Design a protein around this ligand. Structure first.
Ligand SMILES: *[C@@H]1O[C@H](CO)[C@@H](O[C@@H]2O[C@H](CO)[C@@H](O[C@@H]3O[C@H](CO)[C@@H](O)[C@H](O)[C@@H]3O)[C@H](O)[C@H]2NC(C)=O)[C@H](O)[C@H]1NC(C)=O
Ligand SMILES: *[C@@H]1O[C@H](CO)[C@@H](O[C@@H]2O[C@H](CO)[C@@H](O)[C@H](O)[C@H]2NC(C)=O)[C@H](O)[C@H]1NC(C)=O
Lengths: 50, 35
């Protein structure tokens, strides 16, 4: 099929109307980041000739 | 109905007439960048 970009809505804009929240939620989100990789070493002479 | 208190966003909002549906500024950018 053809990709769909998301749900479609239309906010009710007007020149003398406003929207204000009356409650709240508290959410916890996760983020993962790599900081290092393994320290390796190679001795060229033993690798090449041996 | 586009009544934003005097501000006019026509050059940045999409153009219904054109088939590409791209704003007036975005069309000049696409024309201007040709191999
Ligand atoms: C703002 O939102 C919170 C929820 O995020 C509202 O609190 C929730 O209120 C409902 C109805 O009072 C609670 O449901 C009921 O709980 C009782 C247990 O006491 C249960 O017996 C009922 O069957 C029903 O499930 C709900 O538990 C409660 N949520 C929490 C986390 O406590 C709050 O009322 C909202 N504030 C306003 C001003 O609308
Ligand atoms: C927003 O600005 C555009 C650009 O000036 C206006 O478009 C012009 O409109 C007049 C009157 O309809 C035409 O004579 C010009 O040829 C239009 N110019 C272009 C480049 O299309 C547009 O009217 C403005 N928006 C409002 C609500 O006035």
């Amino acid at each position: 099929y053809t990709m769909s970009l998301g749900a479609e809505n239309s906010v009710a804009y007007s020149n003398n109307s406003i929207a204000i929240p009356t409650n709240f939620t508290i959410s916890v989100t996760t983020e993962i980041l790599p900081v290092s990789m393994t320290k390796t070493s190679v001795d060229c002479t033993m690798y090449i000739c041996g | 109905i586009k009544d934003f208190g005097g501000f006019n966003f026509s050059q940045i909002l999409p153009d219904p007439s054109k088939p590409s549906k791209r704003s007036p500024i975005e069309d000049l950018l696409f024309n201007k960048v040709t191999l």
